[PDB]
C-alpha cells in the first residue's frame, strides 16, 4: 500500500543527501570536516541508488574530491 511512496522517498533521499553534499561545499568551502561530511553525504546518497548515473558519478567524482583533499594534503599541508 505505500511500495511507491518507498520507492520515491527512497530515490529522493538520494537527491536530499546529495543536495546537503553540495550546497555544503557551496555554504563554507573547504576545511577538515569535509572528509566525513561529502564521504557521509555521497554515499549515504549511494545507500539508495548506484544505477542513477547522476547520483553515483556525483560520488565517484566527490571520491576524485576527496582523493584530491589528500592531493592537496601532499600539496599543501605537507609543504607549505
Known amino acids: 500500500e505505500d511500495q511507491q511512496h518507498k520507492q520515491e522517498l527512497h530515490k ?3 537527491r536530499c543527501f546529495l543536495k546537503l553534499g553540495e550546497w555544503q561545499l557551496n555554504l563554507q568551502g573547504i576545511n577538515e570536516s569535509t572528509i566525513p561530511k561529502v564521504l557521509q553525504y ?3 546518497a549511494t545507500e539508495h541508488d548506484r544505477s542513477w548515473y547522476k547520483a553515483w558519478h556525483a560520488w565517484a567524482v566527490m571520491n ?3 582523493v ?9 599541508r605537507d609543504e607549505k
Not at 584530491?68 to 599543501?76: D, T, V
Open 42 to 44: 555521497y554515499s549515504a
Open 68 to 76: 584530491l583533499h589528500y592531493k592537496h594534503q601532499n600539496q599543501a
Open 12 to 14: 529522493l533521499m538520494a
Open 64 to 66: 576524485f574530491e576527496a
